[PDB]
Every structure is written in structure tokens, then in C-alpha cells.
Copies of this chain bind each other. A is one copy, B any other.
């Protein structure tokens, strides 16, 4: 598929860290430039809690994409569809539910 269709837990982190060209020696003058064109692509630390049976479907999706092969996602932050990739997605398997901890790095290509 091409669309992450699961619902994330309340606590979700959004780091931005824009990329700029900064020049400064010691404590003297400083110059700042916006470097690239596609500003900052952010990073979403996302956690999900799904029953022990849907864990297989979610992991099959993530492993089929396998680090590359960005997919479409609509974060509940700005509600605007973007393209992201996931590279870690660790999982913790409780007695009745499982908890995915993954990262989504927004991309362009």
C-alpha cells in the first residue's frame, strides 16, 4: 500500500531542527543563510497501541516498506498529507496489546 492507516497515541513528538548555513568565529559577528530550499522536514516520534493480532499487519506494512519506499501519511498535527519514511519501529509486546515506537522522517522525493 501507500498510506499509513493507523491511529497514533496522544503523546507524539515533533522535532524541527531547520538546516541553515551559519558562519561565526569566536564571539564576533554572525551571518545566517537559509541553506537549502526545502527548509526543515521535521521528525515525528510516533507511538501506537494495537491488539496482538493487528501487530502482524502493521509490522508487515512497515517491513514491506523497509526503510526506503516512503509512504503517504496525514499527521494529526497540521492535518496535511505528507510523505515519510520509517527506519526503526521497535515494538513491545504486552499480554494483550502491543506498542509500536517508530520515527517518521518527512521527505520530498
Contacts and interface: CB of A to CB of B under 8 A. Distances in A.
Interface residues of A, number: 55
Contacts of A29: 38, 108-109
Given A32-B85, A68-B33, A18 B93 contact: no
Interface in A1-52: 10-20, 22, 26-41
- How many copies, total? 3
A70 to B, nearest CB: 8
A16 B29 CA distance: 17
A50 to B, nearest CB: 12
Interface of A: 10-20, 22, 26-41, 55-56, 59, 62-63, 66-70, 76-78, 85, 87-95, 98, 107-109
